[PDB]
Design an enzyme around this catalytic site. Structure first.
Site, PDB file in Angstrom:
ATOM      1  N   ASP A  27       0.815  -1.212   0.000  1.00 42.57           N
ATOM      2  CA  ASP A  27       0.000   0.000   0.000  1.00 42.57           C
ATOM      3  C   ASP A  27       0.852   1.267   0.000  1.00 42.57           C
ATOM      4  O   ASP A  27       0.619   2.183   0.788  1.00 42.57           O
ATOM      5  CB  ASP A  27      -0.937   0.001   1.215  1.00 42.57           C
ATOM      6  CG  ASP A  27      -2.080   1.002   1.080  1.00 42.57           C
ATOM      7  OD1 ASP A  27      -2.247   1.586  -0.010  1.00 42.57           O
ATOM      8  OD2 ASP A  27      -2.814   1.202   2.069  1.00 42.57           O
ATOM      9  N   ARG A  65      -0.782   8.902   1.264  1.00 47.56           N
ATOM     10  CA  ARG A  65      -1.499   8.936   2.542  1.00 47.56           C
ATOM     11  C   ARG A  65      -0.763   8.163   3.632  1.00 47.56           C
ATOM     12  O   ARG A  65      -0.981   8.394   4.828  1.00 47.56           O
ATOM     13  CB  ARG A  65      -2.908   8.354   2.377  1.00 47.56           C
ATOM     14  CG  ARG A  65      -2.917   6.880   2.010  1.00 47.56           C
ATOM     15  CD  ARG A  65      -4.331   6.329   1.836  1.00 47.56           C
ATOM     16  NE  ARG A  65      -4.304   5.029   1.174  1.00 47.56           N
ATOM     17  CZ  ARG A  65      -4.178   4.873  -0.141  1.00 47.56           C
ATOM     18  NH1 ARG A  65      -4.077   5.940  -0.919  1.00 47.56           N
ATOM     19  NH2 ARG A  65      -4.141   3.662  -0.678  1.00 47.56           N
ATOM     20  N   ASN A  66       0.103   7.243   3.216  1.00 49.27           N
ATOM     21  CA  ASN A  66       0.823   6.388   4.149  1.00 49.27           C
ATOM     22  C   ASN A  66       2.266   6.834   4.392  1.00 49.27           C
ATOM     23  O   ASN A  66       3.020   6.159   5.094  1.00 49.27           O
ATOM     24  CB  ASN A  66       0.797   4.942   3.649  1.00 49.27           C
ATOM     25  CG  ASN A  66      -0.595   4.335   3.708  1.00 49.27           C
ATOM     26  OD1 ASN A  66      -1.405   4.704   4.559  1.00 49.27           O
ATOM     27  ND2 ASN A  66      -0.879   3.405   2.804  1.00 49.27           N
ATOM     28  N   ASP A 123       2.893   3.906   7.663  1.00 56.31           N
ATOM     29  CA  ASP A 123       1.750   3.030   7.910  1.00 56.31           C
ATOM     30  C   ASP A 123       1.974   1.662   7.279  1.00 56.31           C
ATOM     31  O   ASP A 123       2.372   1.561   6.118  1.00 56.31           O
ATOM     32  CB  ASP A 123       0.477   3.658   7.336  1.00 56.31           C
ATOM     33  CG  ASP A 123      -0.751   2.792   7.555  1.00 56.31           C
ATOM     34  OD1 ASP A 123      -0.939   1.803   6.811  1.00 56.31           O
ATOM     35  OD2 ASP A 123      -1.534   3.107   8.472  1.00 56.31           O
TER      36      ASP A 123
END
Length: 286
Positions: free
Chosen positions: A143, A147-148, A164
């Site tokens: 992922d 955003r991570n 994350d």
């Protein structure tokens, strides 16, 4: 509940327990809090109302992060599991997540010198270094997305880090990050190091678009059909050709045709060296 990385197996017993008394919450950031242990920390909390399964997942991400040792992956300071609610203590990243940063810091009439191309290339290099470390230690993130990623600070000395690991934690439909996934992941559920290469190309697009959602105007299912058919995103506004080329190499249909992160890094380096690249002006949002 055992976790294996870089040759070693671990349990939650291995997690550094920090006495709850030593921990003070300062303010909410997102739940996630700024805390003090005086070492400043980010505190990730587990809602007591959640399931025993969510608690197991919560602890597993603690173990995963704690076993990494690299400058471009957020540090785990420790945990507080002896009290409720459970805490995970992480490196405080005052710059926040990368997507929010890009969107809020876009060049505009207020300050057209907010970001420049070199700033974006440094963020890209930072995350590529983190990804190379994961690759060489045979860890598949699954992922990689703006955003991570987190920033140590808003200002020019900022360092970007992967922050994350929830997706890798689960693996160890409407919610699937299809827009960041290569076809063989899409269709066959096949994940390899080249899975993350594809995602990194999408991340690069996110960075150089200054925080736009990928495949603008397209839904998840539309993207799935688009990408399967050979469709790819156009370059972000004002994106230099050398940078777009890294993206299109990352999005090769066959995994064996996509570069590993060592190659991605050297290409990013070459971009940072090209005056024509780094002197390219970013679009000013009016």
């Amino acid at each position: 509940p055992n976790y294996c990385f870089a040759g070693k197996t671990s349990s939650i017993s291995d997690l550094k327990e920090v006495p709850r008394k030593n921990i003070t919450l300062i303010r909410g950031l997102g739940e996630v809090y700024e805390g003090q242990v005086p070492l400043q920390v980010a505190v990730k909390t587990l809602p007591e109302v959640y399931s025993e399964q969510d608690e197991l997942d919560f602890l597993m991400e603690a173990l995963i992060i704690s076993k990494f040792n690299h400058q471009n992956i957020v540090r785990c300071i420790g945990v507080s599991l002896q009290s409720l609610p459970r805490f995970i203590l992480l490196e405080l990243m005052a710059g926040g997540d990368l997507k929010s940063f890009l969107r809020e810091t876009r060049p505009r009439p207020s300050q057209p010198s907010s970001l420049a191309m070199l700033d974006l290339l440094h963020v890209a290099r930072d995350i590529a270094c983190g990804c190379q470390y994961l690759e060489e230690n045979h860890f598949i993130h699954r992922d990689i997305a703006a955003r991570n990623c987190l920033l140590t600070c808003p200002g020019p000395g900022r360092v970007a880090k992967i922050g994350d690991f929830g997706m890798a934690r689960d693996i160890y439909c409407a919610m699937l990050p299809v827009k960041w996934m290569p076809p063989e992941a899409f269709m066959e559920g096949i994940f390899t190091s080249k899975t993350d290469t594809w995602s990194f190309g999408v991340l690069l697009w996110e960075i150089f678009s200054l925080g736009y959602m990928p495949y603008p105007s397209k839904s998840n299912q539309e993207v799935l059909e688009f990408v399967t058919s050979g469709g790819r995103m156009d370059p972000p506004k004002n994106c230099p050709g050398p940078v777009y080329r890294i993206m299109t190499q990352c999005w090769q249909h066959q995994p064996e045709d996509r570069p590993n992160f060592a190659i991605i890094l050297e290409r990013i380096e070459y971009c940072t060296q090209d005056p024509d690249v780094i002197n390219t002006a970013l679009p000013i949002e009016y």
